[PDB]
Coordinates of C-alpha atoms in Angstrom, one line a residue:
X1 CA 75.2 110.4 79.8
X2 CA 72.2 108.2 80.8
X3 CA 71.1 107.5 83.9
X4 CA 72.4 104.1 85.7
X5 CA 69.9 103.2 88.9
X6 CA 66.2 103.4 89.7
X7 CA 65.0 103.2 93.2
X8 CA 61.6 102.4 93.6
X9 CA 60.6 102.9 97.7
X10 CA 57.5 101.0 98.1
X11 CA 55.4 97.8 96.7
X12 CA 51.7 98.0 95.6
X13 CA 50.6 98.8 92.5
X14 CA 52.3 101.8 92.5
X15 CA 55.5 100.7 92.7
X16 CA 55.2 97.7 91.2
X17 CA 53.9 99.1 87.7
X18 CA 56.3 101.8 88.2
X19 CA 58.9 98.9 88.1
X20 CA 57.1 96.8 85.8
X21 CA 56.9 99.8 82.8
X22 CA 60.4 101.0 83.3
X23 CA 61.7 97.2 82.3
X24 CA 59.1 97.5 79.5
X25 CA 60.4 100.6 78.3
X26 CA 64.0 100.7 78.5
X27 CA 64.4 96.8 79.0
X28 CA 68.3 95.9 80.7
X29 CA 69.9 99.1 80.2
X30 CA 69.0 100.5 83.3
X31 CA 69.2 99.1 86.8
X32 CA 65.7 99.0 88.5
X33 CA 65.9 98.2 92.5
X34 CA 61.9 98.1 94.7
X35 CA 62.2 98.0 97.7
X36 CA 59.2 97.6 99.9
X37 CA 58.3 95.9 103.2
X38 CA 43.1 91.5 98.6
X39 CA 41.4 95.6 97.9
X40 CA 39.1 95.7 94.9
X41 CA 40.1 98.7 92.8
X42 CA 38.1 100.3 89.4
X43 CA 40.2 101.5 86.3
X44 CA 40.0 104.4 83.9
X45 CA 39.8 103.5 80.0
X46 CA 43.8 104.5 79.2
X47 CA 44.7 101.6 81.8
X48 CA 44.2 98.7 78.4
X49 CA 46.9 100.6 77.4
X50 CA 49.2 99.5 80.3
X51 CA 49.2 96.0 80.2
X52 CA 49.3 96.1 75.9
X53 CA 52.2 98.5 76.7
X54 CA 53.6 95.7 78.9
X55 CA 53.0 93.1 76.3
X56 CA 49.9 91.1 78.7
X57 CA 46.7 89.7 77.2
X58 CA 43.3 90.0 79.1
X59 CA 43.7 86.2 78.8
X60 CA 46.9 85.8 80.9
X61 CA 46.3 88.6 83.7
X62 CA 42.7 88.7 84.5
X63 CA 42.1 85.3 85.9
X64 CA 45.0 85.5 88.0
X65 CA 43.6 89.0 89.4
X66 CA 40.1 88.2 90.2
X67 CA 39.3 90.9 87.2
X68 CA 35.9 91.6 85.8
X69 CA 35.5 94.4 82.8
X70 CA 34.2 97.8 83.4
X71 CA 32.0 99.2 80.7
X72 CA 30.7 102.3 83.3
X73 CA 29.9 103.4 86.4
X74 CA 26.4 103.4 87.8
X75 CA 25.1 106.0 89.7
X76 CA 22.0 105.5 91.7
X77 CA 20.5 107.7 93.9
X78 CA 22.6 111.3 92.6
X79 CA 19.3 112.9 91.0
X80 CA 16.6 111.9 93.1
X81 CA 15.2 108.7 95.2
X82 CA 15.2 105.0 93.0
X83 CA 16.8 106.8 90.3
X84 CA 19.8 105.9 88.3
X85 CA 22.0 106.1 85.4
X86 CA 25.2 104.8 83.4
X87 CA 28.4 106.7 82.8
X88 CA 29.6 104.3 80.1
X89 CA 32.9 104.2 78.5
X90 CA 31.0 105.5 75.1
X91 CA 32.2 107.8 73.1
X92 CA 29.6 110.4 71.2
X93 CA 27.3 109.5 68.2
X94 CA 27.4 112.2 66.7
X95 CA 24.7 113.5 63.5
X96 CA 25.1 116.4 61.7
X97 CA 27.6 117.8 64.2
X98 CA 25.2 117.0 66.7
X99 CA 25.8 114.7 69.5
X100 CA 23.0 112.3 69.9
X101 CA 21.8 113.5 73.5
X102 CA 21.2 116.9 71.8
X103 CA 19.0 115.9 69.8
X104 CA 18.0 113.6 72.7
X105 CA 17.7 116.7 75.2
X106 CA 15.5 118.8 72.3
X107 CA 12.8 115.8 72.1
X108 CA 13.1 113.4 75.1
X109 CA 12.0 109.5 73.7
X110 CA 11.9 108.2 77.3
X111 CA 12.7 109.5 81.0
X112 CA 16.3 107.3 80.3
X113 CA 18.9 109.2 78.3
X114 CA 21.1 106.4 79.0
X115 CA 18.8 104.1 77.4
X116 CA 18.2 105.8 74.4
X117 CA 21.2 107.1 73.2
X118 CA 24.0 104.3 74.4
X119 CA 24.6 100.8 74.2
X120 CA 26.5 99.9 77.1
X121 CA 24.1 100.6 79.7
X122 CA 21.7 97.9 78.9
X123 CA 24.7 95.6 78.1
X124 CA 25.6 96.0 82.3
X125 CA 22.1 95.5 83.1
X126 CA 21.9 92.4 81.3
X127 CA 25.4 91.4 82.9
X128 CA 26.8 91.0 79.5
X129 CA 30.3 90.7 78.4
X130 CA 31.8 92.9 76.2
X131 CA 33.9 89.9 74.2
X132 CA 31.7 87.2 72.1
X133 CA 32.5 83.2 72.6
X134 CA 34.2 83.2 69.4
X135 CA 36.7 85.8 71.5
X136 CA 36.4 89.4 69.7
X137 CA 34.9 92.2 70.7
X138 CA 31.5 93.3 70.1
X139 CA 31.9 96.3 68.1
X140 CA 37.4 102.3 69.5
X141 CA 34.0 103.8 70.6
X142 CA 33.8 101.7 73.6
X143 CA 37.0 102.6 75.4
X144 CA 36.6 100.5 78.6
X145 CA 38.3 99.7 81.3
X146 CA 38.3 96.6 84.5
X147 CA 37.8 95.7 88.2
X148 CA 40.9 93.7 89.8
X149 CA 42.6 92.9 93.2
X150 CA 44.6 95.4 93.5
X151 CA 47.2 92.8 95.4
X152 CA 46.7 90.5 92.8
X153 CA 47.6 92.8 90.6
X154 CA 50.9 93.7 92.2
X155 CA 52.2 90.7 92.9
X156 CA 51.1 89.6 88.9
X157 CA 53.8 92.7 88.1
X158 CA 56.0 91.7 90.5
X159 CA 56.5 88.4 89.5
X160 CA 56.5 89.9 85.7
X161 CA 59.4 92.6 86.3
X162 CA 61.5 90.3 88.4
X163 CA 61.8 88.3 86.1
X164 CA 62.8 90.8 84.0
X165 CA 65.8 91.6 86.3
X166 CA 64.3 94.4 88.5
X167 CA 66.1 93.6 92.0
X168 CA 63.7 93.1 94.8
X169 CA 64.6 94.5 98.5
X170 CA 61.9 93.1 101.1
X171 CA 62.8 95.5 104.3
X172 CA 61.3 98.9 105.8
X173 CA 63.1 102.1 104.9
X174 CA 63.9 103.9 108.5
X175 CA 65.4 107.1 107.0
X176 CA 65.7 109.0 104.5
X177 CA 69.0 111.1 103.6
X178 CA 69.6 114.1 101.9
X179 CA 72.9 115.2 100.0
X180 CA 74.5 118.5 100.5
X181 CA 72.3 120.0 98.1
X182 CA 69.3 118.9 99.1
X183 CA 69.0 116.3 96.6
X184 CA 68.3 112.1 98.0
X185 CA 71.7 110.6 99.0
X186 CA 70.2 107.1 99.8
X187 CA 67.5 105.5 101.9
X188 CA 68.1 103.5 105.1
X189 CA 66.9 100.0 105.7
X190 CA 66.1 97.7 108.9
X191 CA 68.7 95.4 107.9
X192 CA 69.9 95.9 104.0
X193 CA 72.0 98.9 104.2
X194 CA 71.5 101.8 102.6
X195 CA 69.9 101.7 99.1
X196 CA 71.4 104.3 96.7
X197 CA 70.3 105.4 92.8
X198 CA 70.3 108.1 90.4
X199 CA 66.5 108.5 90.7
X200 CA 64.2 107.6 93.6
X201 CA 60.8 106.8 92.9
X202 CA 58.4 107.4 96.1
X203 CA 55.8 104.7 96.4
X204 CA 54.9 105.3 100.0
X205 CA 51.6 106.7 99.4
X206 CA 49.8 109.0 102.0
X207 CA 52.9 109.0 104.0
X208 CA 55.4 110.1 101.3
X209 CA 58.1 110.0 102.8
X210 CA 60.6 111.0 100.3
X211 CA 58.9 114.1 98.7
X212 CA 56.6 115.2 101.3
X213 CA 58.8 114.0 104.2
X214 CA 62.6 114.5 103.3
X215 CA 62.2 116.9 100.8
X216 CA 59.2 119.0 102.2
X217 CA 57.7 119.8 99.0
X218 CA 54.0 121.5 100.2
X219 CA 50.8 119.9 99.4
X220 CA 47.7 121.8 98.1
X221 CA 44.6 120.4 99.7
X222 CA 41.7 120.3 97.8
X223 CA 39.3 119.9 100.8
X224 CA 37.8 123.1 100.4
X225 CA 36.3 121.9 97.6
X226 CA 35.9 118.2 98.0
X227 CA 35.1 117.6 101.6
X228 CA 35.2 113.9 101.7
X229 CA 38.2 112.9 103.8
X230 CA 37.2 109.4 104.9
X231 CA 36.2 105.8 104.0
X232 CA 35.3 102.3 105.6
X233 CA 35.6 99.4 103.5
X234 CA 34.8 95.6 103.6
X235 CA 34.7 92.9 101.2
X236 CA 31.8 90.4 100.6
X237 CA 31.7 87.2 98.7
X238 CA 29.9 87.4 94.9
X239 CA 26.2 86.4 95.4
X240 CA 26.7 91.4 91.4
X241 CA 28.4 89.8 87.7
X242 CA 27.4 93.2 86.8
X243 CA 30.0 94.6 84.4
X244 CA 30.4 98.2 85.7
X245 CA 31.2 100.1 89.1
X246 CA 28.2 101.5 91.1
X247 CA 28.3 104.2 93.0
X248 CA 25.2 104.9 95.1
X249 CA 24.6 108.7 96.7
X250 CA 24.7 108.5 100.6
X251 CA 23.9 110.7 103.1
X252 CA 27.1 112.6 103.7
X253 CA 28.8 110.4 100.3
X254 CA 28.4 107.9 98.1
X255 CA 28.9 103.9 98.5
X256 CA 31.0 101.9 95.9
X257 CA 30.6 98.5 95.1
X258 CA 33.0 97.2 92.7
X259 CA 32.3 93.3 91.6
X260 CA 35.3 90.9 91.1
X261 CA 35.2 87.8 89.9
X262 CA 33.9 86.0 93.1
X263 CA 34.6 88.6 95.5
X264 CA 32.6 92.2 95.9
X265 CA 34.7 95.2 97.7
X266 CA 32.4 98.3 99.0
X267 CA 33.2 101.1 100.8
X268 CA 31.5 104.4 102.5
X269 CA 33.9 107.2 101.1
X270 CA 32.6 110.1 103.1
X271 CA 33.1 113.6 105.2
X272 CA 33.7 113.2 108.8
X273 CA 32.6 116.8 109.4
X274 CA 29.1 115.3 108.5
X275 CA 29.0 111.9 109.8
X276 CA 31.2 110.0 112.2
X277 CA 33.4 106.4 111.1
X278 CA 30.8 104.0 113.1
X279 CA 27.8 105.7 111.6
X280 CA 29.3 105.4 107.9
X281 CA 30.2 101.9 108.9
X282 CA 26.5 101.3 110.1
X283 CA 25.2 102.4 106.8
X284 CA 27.6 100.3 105.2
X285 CA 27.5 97.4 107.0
X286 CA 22.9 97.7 106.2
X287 CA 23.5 98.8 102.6
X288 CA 25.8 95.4 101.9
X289 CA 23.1 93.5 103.7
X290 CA 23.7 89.6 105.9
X291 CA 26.6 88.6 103.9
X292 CA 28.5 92.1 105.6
X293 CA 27.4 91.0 109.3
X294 CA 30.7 89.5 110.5
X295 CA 33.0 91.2 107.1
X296 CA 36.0 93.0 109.1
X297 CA 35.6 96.8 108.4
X298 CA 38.4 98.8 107.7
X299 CA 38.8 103.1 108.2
X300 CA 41.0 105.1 106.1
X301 CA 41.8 108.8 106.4
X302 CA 42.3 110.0 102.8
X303 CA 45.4 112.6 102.0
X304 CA 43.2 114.8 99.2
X305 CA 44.7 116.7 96.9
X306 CA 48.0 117.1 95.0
X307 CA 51.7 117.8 95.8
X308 CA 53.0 121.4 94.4
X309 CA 55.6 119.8 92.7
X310 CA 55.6 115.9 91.8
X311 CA 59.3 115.5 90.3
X312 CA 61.8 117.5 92.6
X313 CA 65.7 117.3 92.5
X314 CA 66.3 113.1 92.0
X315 CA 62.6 112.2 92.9
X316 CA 59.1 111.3 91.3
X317 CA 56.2 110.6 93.5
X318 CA 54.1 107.9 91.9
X319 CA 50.4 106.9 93.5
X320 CA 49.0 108.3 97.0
X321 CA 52.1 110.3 97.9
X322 CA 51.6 112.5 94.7
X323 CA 48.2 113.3 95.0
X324 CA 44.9 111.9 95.5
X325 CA 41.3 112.7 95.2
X326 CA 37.9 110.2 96.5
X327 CA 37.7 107.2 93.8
X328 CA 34.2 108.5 92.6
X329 CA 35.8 108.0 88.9
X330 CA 38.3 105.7 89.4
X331 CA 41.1 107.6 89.2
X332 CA 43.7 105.9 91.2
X333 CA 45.2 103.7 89.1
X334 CA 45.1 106.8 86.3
X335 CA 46.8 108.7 88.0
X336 CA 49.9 106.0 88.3
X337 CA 49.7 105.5 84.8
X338 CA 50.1 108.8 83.4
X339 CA 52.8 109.6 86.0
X340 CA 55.1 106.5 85.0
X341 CA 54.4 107.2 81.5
X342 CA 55.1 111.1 81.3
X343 CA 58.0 110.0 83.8
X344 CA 59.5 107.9 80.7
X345 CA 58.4 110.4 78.1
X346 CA 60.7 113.3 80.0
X347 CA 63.1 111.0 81.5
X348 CA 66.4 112.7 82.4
X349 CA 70.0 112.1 81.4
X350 CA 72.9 112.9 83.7
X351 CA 72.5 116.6 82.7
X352 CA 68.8 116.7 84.8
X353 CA 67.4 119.0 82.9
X354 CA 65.3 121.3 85.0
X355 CA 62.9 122.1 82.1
X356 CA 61.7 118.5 81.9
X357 CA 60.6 119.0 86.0
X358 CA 58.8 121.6 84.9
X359 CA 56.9 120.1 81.9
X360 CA 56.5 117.1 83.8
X361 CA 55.2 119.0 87.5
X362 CA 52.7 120.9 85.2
X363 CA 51.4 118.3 82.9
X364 CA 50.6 115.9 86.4
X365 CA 49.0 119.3 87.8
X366 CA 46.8 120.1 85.4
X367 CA 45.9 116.2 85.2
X368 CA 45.0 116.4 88.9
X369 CA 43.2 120.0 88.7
X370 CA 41.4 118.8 86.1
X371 CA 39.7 115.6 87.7
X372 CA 39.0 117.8 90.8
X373 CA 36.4 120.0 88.7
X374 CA 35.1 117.2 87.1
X375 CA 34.9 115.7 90.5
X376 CA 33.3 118.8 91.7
X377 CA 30.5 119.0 89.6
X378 CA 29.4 115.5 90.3
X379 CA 28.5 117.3 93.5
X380 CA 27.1 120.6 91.9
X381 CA 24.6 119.0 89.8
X382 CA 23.5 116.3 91.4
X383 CA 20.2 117.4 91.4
X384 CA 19.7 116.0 95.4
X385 CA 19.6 119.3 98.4
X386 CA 18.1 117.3 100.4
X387 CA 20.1 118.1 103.6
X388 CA 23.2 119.9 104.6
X389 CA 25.5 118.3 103.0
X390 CA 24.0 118.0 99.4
X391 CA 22.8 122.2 99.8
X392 CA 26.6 122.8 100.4
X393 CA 28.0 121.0 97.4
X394 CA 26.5 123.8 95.8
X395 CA 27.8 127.1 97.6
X396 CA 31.5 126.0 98.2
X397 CA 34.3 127.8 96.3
X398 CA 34.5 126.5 93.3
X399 CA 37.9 125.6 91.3
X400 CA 38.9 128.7 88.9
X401 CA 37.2 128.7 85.5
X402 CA 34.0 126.1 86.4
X403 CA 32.0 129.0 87.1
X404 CA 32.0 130.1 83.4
X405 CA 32.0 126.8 81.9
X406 CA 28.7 126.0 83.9
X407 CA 27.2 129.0 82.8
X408 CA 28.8 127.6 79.0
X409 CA 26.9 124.1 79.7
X410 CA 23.3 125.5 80.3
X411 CA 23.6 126.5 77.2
X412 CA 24.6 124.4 74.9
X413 CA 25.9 120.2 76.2
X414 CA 29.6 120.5 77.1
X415 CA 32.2 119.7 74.1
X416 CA 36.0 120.0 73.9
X417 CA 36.1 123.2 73.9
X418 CA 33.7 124.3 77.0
X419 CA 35.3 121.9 79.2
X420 CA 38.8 122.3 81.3
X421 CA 41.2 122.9 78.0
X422 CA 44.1 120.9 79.3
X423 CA 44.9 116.6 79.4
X424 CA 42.7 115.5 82.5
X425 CA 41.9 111.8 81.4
X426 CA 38.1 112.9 80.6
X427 CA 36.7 113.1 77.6
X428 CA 33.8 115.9 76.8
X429 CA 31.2 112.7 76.6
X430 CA 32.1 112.0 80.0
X431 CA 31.0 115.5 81.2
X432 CA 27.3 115.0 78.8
X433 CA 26.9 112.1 80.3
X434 CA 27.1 113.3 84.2
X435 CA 25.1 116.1 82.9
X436 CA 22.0 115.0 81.8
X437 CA 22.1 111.7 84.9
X438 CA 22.6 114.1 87.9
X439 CA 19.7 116.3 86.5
X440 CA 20.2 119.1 88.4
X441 CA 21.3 121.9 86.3
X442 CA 19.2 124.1 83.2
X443 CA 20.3 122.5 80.3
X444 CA 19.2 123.3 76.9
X445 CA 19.3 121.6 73.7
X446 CA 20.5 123.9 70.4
X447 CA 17.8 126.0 68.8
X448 CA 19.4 125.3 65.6
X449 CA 18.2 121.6 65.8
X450 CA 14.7 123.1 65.3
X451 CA 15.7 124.2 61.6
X452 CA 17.8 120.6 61.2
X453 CA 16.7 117.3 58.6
X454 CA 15.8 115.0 61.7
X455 CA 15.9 112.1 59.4
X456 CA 19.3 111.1 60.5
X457 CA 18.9 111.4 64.3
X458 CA 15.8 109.5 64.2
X459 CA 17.5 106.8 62.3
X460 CA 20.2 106.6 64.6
X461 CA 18.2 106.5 68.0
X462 CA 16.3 103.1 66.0
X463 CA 19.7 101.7 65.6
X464 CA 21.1 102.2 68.9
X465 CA 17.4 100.1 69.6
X466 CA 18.4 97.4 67.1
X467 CA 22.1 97.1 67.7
X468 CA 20.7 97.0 71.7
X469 CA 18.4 94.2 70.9
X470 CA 21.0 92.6 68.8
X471 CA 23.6 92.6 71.3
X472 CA 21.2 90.9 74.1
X473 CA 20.5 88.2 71.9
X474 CA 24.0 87.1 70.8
X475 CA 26.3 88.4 74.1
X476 CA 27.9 85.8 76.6
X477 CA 27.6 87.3 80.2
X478 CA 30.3 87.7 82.1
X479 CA 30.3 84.4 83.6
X480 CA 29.5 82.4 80.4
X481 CA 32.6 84.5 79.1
X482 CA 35.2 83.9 81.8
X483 CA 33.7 79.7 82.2
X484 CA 34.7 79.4 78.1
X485 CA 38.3 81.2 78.7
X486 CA 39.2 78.8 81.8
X487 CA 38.0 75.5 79.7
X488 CA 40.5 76.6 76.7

């Protein structure tokens, strides 16, 4: 009854953790087959859940990759002029029932909420690691994630499920066929033949040329309400250690820089109604400064938004060809992740069920719907209107359902249950967090805190102090870290 051939059309990391997690999950008894002809990338917390899944220490794969860890993102510039603020991977103190920035919010102890109620933003400042000499962890509350090269990382999987037995096929697919009910027969190579499975995987990305090529399956834009639709990246070499992603406000977007070991990638992601690709590469090239003069630039057209349908007849889209919005949370490698993994969880017998299609196409959807509001209000409340483009994020449509959870927000700091109600990745402290840094919406902290024992909130902003200071003294950075791991 089960299944007896994969066929994964495409390489990158995509395919290649598609590949890599299928031999994890159901080992020799199926046949996987890739076939498929340096970028720094930024990871989501679930993603230490990949390689654990895969059985791969931090040890083993992130020298190999160029990886750094990511305890946040830092976002400069959102609010207002010289300002900034950490997203951290951080999950809520909370006192009372409280969360810590309420009480925060009530009685402000600086201008920094970061700083007062978090650890981990002073822990990137000071360029720390998140692992001591003696090897553990500092402290999960701290649910954090990594930078790699994204190449690196591909060929690390590829080398990891070949020799697992998944079959490799280096060649370019020229066609794809369809059956007599509309279902793939088999893809066409240059010079292998045609490939045949039981289940196609498309890897293509943007192009998708199995789901939204052969098959036709429509694609919902979400351009209406994120209008970035370009980027122009280049890569520098490390002077930046900085343990988190920064992503700095721009004109008409926002700048990444995304530190690897001894290589920084940075990129313009922006809207080309606003700003044309040799003026975003102008900025670029100023905001990277000399070591960008003579860096080759490189322009991408982005594909945002999601397929209709993500499984459909015999195949799964996996990575750009199933949907995509602008990296601003890291998100890409997420969204592989909980495709491959949902993609096991309802994997079909020889029966296809069509209800697991369904389950599957609306659990993906709602993960992609999801990250487009919270991606949307990034723009809505950044407190910046300081031309055209940052008035408009403001009056464009706005995703059903965020107009009443703002309205929810400025009154009492988002939780689970005033935030999008289905599986999106973020976590309600994710949505405090972007809150309170991008400053531009009426919050209010909770009357009732007025009537409250303050006691145990002012004892827990003077330990977040201590347990700050404590962690400065005793924490390797980054570089002390990764020195100690390549002498053992």
């Amino acid at each position: 009854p089960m299944l007896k051939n994969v066929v994964v059309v495409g390489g990158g990391t995509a395919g290649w953790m598609t590949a890599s997690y299928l031999t994890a999950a159901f080992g020799d008894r199926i046949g996987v087959t890739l076939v498929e002809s340096g970028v720094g990338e930024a990871t989501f917390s679930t993603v230490r859940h990949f390689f654990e899944y895969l059985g791969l220490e931090e040890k083993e794969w992130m020298p190999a990759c160029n990886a750094t860890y990511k305890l946040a993102i830092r976002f400069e510039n959102w609010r207002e002029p010289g300002h900034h603020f950490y997203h951290p991977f951080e999950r809520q103190r909370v006192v009372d029932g409280f969360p810590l920035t309420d009480w925060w919010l009530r009685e402000p102890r600086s201008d920094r909420f970061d700083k007062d109620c978090f650890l981990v933003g002073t822990l990137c400042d000071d360029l720390k690691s998140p692992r001591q000499l003696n090897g553990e962890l500092f402290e999960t509350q701290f649910p954090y994630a990594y930078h790699f090269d994204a190449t690196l990382v591909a060929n690390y999987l590829r080398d990891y499920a070949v020799a697992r037995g998944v079959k490799h096929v280096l060649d370019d697919v020229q066609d794809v066929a369809l059956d007599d009910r509309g279902w793939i027969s088999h893809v066409v190579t240059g010079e292998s033949g045609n490939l045949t499975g039981d289940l196609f995987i498309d890897c293509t990305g943007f192009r998708s040329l199995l789901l939204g090529k052969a098959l036709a399956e429509p694609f919902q834009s979400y351009q209406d309400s994120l209008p970035n639709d370009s980027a122009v990246a280049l890569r520098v070499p490390q002077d930046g250690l900085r343990p988190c992603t920064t992503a700095t406000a721009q004109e008409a977007g926002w700048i990444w820089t995304i530190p690897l070991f001894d290589r920084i990638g940075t990129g313009y992601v922006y809207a080309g109604d606003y700003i044309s690709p040799e003026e975003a590469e102008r900025t670029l090239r100023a905001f990277v400064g000399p070591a960008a003069e003579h860096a080759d630039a490189n322009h991408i057209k982005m594909r945002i938004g999601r397929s209709n349908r993500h499984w459909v007849n015999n195949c799964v889209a996996v990575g750009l060809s199933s949907g995509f919005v602008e990296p601003l949370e890291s998100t890409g490698i997420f969204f592989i992740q909980h495709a491959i993994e949902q993609l096991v969880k309802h994997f079909p017998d020889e029966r296809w069920d069509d209800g697991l299609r369904t389950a599957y196409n609306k659990l993906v959807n709602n993960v992609m719907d999801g990250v487009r509001e919270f991606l949307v209000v990034h723009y809505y409340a950044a407190k910046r209107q300081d031309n055209q483009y940052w008035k408009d994020a403001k009056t464009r449509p706005l995703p059903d359902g965020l107009a009443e959870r703002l309205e929810r927000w400025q009154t009492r700091l988002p939780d689970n249950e005033s935030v999008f109600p289905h599986y999106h990745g973020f976590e309600s402290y994710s949505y405090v967090c972007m809150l309170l840094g991008l400053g531009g919406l009426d919050l209010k902290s909770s009357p009732a805190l007025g009537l409250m024992d303050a006691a145990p909130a002012r004892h827990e902003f003077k330990l977040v102090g201590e347990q700050a200071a404590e962690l400065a003294r005793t924490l390797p950075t980054q570089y002390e870290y990764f020195a100690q791991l390549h002498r053992a």
